Design a protein around this ligand. Structure first.
Ligand SMILES: Nc1ncnc2c1ncn2[C@@H]1O[C@H](COP(=O)(O)OP(=O)(O)NP(=O)(O)O)[C@@H](O)[C@H]1O
Ligand SMILES: Nc1ncnc2c1ncn2[C@@H]1O[C@H](COP(=O)(O)OP(=O)(O)NP(=O)(O)O)[C@@H](O)[C@H]1O
Ligand SMILES: Nc1ccn([C@@H]2O[C@H](COP(=O)(O)OP(=O)(O)O)[C@@H](O)[C@H]2O)c(=O)n1
Ligand SMILES: Nc1ccn([C@@H]2O[C@H](COP(=O)(O)OP(=O)(O)O)[C@@H](O)[C@H]2O)c(=O)n1
Ligand SMILES: [Mg+2]
Ligand SMILES: [Mg+2]
Lengths: 643, 643
């Protein structure tokens, strides 16, 4: 069904011709083709085809349906071919690095994000997952320039975070007409329609003092007038601390059109508060009860899972990019926290480490341990990969090229945190899981900064490194005013960074891993399992245990189907198992938030913290938000899932 | 209720401040303000306020509701003030010309189009009614650049004609993806949505060999899937002669994607036919029965009044702009026929002559005659006005400035043709009406070319005059291979044009006059009355006659209400009256088309020929189209009205 020889497969993909039009349509770049032909024997003999069976049925089907390159509707690539295409696409002439990446990916130590898997080694290799776009100007020309830019980015793969704080609100004056602005909603409908035309995937960012806020937060509601909804876009709130204070005090909140109150989004913290309370005192806006807004926000979150919540002041106070300017948005999945401006669209290239790969029974007596030294080594590899992607990437718009080449941010993440705890017999809410969580993120952050510092000794630091927190020896945990756990030597690293610089302004942004975790067969990313039963497949670790204890029968299976993936209150199942295989609906969200806060001291950017509320009340949701906020989180909430 | 002194009114408008924001919002330009202050006594004393009563109730209300400038929701301008503001807005420092235009407009000899009436004398004086826009390129970038340009033009006043022949059709290949084009309809929905956002008014032009044609023609249907309709846009067909021949032969017709059949819209006539039949023979497209398309077109016209029909080869063969390139569209109302390209958006400034103004009882014995010499003199005035507008206009986009300054087209038109015939006791379908129609259009065309030639002796000819038909002594009627009626001396004019040039590439484009004819109180533009009764106002001329004959009673009035504006088959009304006051539903469309064809030999551009079909059949509509087509018409049909 598929040619075996890799160079033979490369040849077919490269020579490919669209029969219907007679147009040659190479699916491999000149570059990678010439590389493969000059090295065919080394390359062909390196692939271990046994490794195609490291995938599950649903992992293979995921690859088959979307990832493996097709010739005339037929799969042309084997999984091993996809992986070697990616390796060369990243590494180019560096055959050695390519070979190392081939071996580590093929053994499932790590993977790159979907767009890298799609486009690495191909003629327009757009490998970035994330674009953060500034609304160019409060004008028809700026709106339409911004729209063109989103269209062109959406032509390729990857999401958009778009901030729109600078657009004048409903009823605002326009110079040259007697008519007024119709505000955000009509303009959002324009963007919605472009998202649909160019083959969703836009998040919109707004600060809650904007006067169109009440409609903005309701944009995904499945009822009401069809011309007030924008159903393919996601609203995200970019929330100042002052809003949270006014809500908690049960105080007032003032809504402005940005034309009546200029500059509010171009400052944060104390400067924001001073500027805000001054405009408030000067009668420039419309005052409400803060809790009236607060309540409408919880209503929309309860109904639609949105708006997302990202804390503006936490993002800005604790960003290594703070020498660039004020950060005005996150991205589609709320992990990326990078500077953007009309001339600079922040981009990011993504990869995730497979956490269970580092478990070894290695020891005396059948206990599993965690190999942190190997985690550290693989994270260095991935860091070097992501840095290469930056240089070999095709940028859809010039604003993205200019941003990426200047600041060189990258984003490492994880999958299989849940599997890891499960394999080590650690309940997600245990003291041992809490510790392992901190140690894992300490080592990945240590490793990435070390790799990046080595790159800066080879190539120079990134352009804007001088003046950064990192240039002053201030690493992420220091900006949380915490000492690191200290499994790695931070003083020596900080010494080296201050002397040599780093090659990347940012390194860590744990992402959802929605498709890539399915390819590898692990749970997802720092999140607990959502059920133990996802045509019905039972949690392999749970299955193993129930068989070993000799309790697994049809009576067991039904009790799992019927309680949808929960094993609690199953009569004859040991407590150790119930503790180990708690669903995310069964774990306290204060625990989830605690662990998010623990790991966040080692996270440069942010992370996509989904929240899961069993029996949701306004009161429970409020206390979750205020708890995350006071913990110092950047991303208070990504999606709210309920039921 | 209104200040009397004009300079006092100018002062208020100029000093105006938006109270709600504290922004100064002048409603008069620096230029006109400084002009008015330096000439206040001459200016104030020239206005004759008696003349505000030359308007009807519904004419005044038209002015009041939309035209007269407002200060804080209150009318600040008197009709005489609006007219003098317009006069200075056109003429500037030329106080004499201003005064002449004031007198002629205030006495209702002529008027300018709405945007001139809105914006003349104001800070952003966008006075043009018509923009013809080329789709920039078959790419996401070109589509979105075009969209931005339409948005910016629509911010101001005036319609868009947009040609889209160059966009690849549904299912076409895209290089760099496995997916295909979704064609025109999705892209049309993008434009529809922008039209709604920026405060309809777009016509779309397509040649009927495009493979998306069947959906394109159905875009205004009031049923079917909401995502195949574009309800605020108007489809217009840009029809090659070959299509009409294939339909009449009951032959085949081939549909192409422009990417499979390049160049089809960049040629016409014989070159088009040769290129087309070659692509047809080479299997590059999909063949159908021509009459299958023909039938779907009549169905859409019957249901929706659209698509408009404009004959591509007639427009190109008979255009003075033919040295520029191939013309690919008309405009929103199908009167403008001008060259457009990605870097040149054709524009046009419009004015209409009030035809009844030139009727004088002057004579021996109470007969009315028509003063052609005075018509000729007023048309020269209007021609000079329109040329000044070109230079004092604020262009919304650079593409429009570049086109207008190069070719300098203008568009004179008419209103009150119906009133004129009625006042002279000439039935619309009579031999005398047929003659007067030809003589009126002969004099307006003679007058405009004479004024324009005088301008070229003062300022030089327009930039692209060399190589034009007019430069070779070929005037419009010559391109119809007809001798002029000869009430004016054409040889001397043609001699002068060949020697001196003309200042304007085009001069005549009779337009709908939808609002301006209401302001003046006349019927419309070369069209018969649609009824004799339009809160119920009876045709003043008919009323006068029925009173004079002593037959006008409540029994008369009811018979008019009840037959909706028709006097035919009213028992006791003289035949002379029935002949004189035929409704447009009562006049043969072969007569309408004959008169359109007669006048067209003196029309540089085209004219907005609405058609009215009483009891419509596929057969009647077909023969109307083929009759106009064979007559050599450019605009075969604007709207189809029925019932
Ligand atoms: N015709 C329109 N329809 C809808 N919104 C408009 C329109 N014109 C302007 N706006 C909105 O008002 C804002 C200003 O648009 P812009 O193109 O800068 O107008 P302008 O003529 O320059 N007047 P101003 O910006 O007040 O000096 C943007 O947020 C637009 O979306
Ligand atoms: N992602 C998309 N969604 C919808 N239409 C598209 C998309 N990409 C291209 N098109 C359409 O296909 C045409 C070509 O678009 P363009 O941006 O030039 O694509 P391209 O990548 O340059 N490929 P090609 O034009 O075939 O060389 C235009 O008519 C577009 O509307
Ligand atoms: N449906 C999606 C999911 C993610 N993304 C982008 O990809 C990034 C990472 O999401 P992910 O980890 O779920 O993506 P995969 O690489 O696993 O497909 C996000 O931050 C988005 O910018 C997208 O464009 N569309
Ligand atoms: N509703 C309309 C009508 C006309 N127009 C433009 O104005 C031109 C002349 O139409 P018209 O003679 O009915 O306009 P008025 O000047 O009488 O308002 C058309 O060719 C269009 O380009 C428009 O933009 N919107
Ligand atoms: Mg502006
Ligand atoms: Mg292209």
């Amino acid at each position: 069904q598929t040619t075996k020889q890799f160079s033979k497969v490369v040849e077919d993909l490269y020579r490919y011709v669209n029969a219907a039009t007679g147009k040659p349509a190479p699916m491999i770049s000149d570059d990678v083709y010439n590389i493969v032909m000059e090295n065919k024997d080394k390359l062909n003999s390196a692939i271990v085809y046994d490794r195609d069976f490291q995938y599950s049925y649903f992992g293979f089907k995921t690859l088959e349906r979307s990832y493996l390159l097709r010739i005339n509707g037929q799969v042309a690539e084997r999984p091993q071919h996809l992986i070697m295409r990616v390796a060369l696409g990243i590494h180019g002439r560096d055959i050695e690095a390519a070979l190392e990446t081939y071996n580590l990916m093929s053994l499932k130590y790590f993977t790159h994000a979907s767009p890298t898997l799609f486009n690495a080694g191909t003629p327009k290799p757009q490998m970035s997952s994330c674009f953060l776009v500034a609304m160019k100007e409060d004008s028809i020309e700026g709106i339409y320039d911004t729209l063109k830019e989103c269209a062109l980015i959406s032509k390729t793969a990857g999401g958009i975070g778009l901030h729109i704080h600078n657009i004048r609100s409903t009823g605002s004056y326009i110079a040259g007409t007697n008519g007024t602005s119709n505000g955000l909603i009509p303009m959002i409908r324009v963007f919605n329609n472009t998202a649909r035309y160019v083959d969703g995937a836009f998040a919109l960012y707004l600060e809650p003092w904007h006067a169109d806020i009440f409609d903005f937060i309701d944009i995904r509601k499945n009822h009401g007038k069809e011309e007030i909804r924008a159903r393919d876009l996601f609203p995200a709130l970019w929330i100042p601390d002052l809003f949270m204070k006014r809500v908690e005090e049960n105080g007032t909140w003032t809504l402005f059109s940005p034309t009546s109150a200029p500059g509010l989004s171009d400052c944060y913290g104390d400067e924001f508060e001073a500027l805000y309370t001054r405009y408030e005192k000067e009668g420039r806006g419309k005052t409400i009860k803060a809790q009236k807004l607060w309540y409408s926000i919880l209503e929309a979150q309860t109904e639609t899972g949105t708006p997302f919540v990202v804390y503006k002041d936490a993002c800005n106070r604790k960003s290594n990019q703070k020498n660039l300017g004020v950060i005005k948005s996150s991205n589609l999945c709320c992990e990326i926290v990078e500077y953007s401006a009309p001339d600079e669209t922040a981009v990011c290239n993504l990869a995730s480490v497979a956490l269970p790969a580092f478990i070894e029974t290695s020891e005396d007596g059948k206990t599993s341990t965690y190999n942190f030294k190997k985690l550290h080594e693989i994270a260095k590899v991935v860091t070097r990969n992501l840095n290469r992607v930056i240089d070999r990437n095709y940028y859809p718009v010039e604003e993205a090229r200019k941003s990426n080449m200047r600041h060189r941010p990258i984003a490492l993440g994880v999958q299989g945190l849940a599997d890891t705890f499960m394999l080590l017999r650690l309940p997600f809410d245990s003291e041992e899981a809490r510790l392992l969580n901190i140690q894992i993120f300490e080592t990945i952050y240590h490793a990435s900064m070390e790799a990046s510092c080595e790159l800066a000794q080879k190539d120079g630091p990134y352009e804007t490194f001088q003046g950064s927190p990192a240039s002053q020896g201030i690493l992420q945990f220091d900006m949380w005013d915490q000492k690191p756990y200290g499994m790695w030597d931070w003083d020596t690293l900080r010494k080296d960074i201050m002397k040599h610089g780093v090659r990347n302004s940012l390194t860590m942004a744990p992402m959802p891993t929605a498709s890539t975790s399915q390819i590898l067969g692990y749970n997802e990313c720092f999140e607990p399992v959502t059920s133990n039963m996802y045509f019905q497949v039972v949690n392999p670790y749970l299955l193993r245990d129930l068989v070993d204890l000799g309790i697994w029968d049809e009576g067991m299976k039904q009790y799992l189907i019927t309680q949808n993936g929960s094993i609690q209150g199953l009569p004859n199942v040991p407590q150790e198992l119930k503790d180990l295989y708690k669903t995310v609906w069964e774990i306290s969200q204060k625990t989830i938030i605690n662990m998010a806060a623990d790991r966040s001291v080692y996270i440069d950017q942010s992370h996509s913290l989904n929240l899961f509320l069993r029996a949701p009340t306004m009161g429970k949701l409020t206390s979750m938000h205020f708890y995350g906020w006071k913990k110092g989180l950047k991303t208070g909430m990504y999606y709210l899932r309920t039921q």
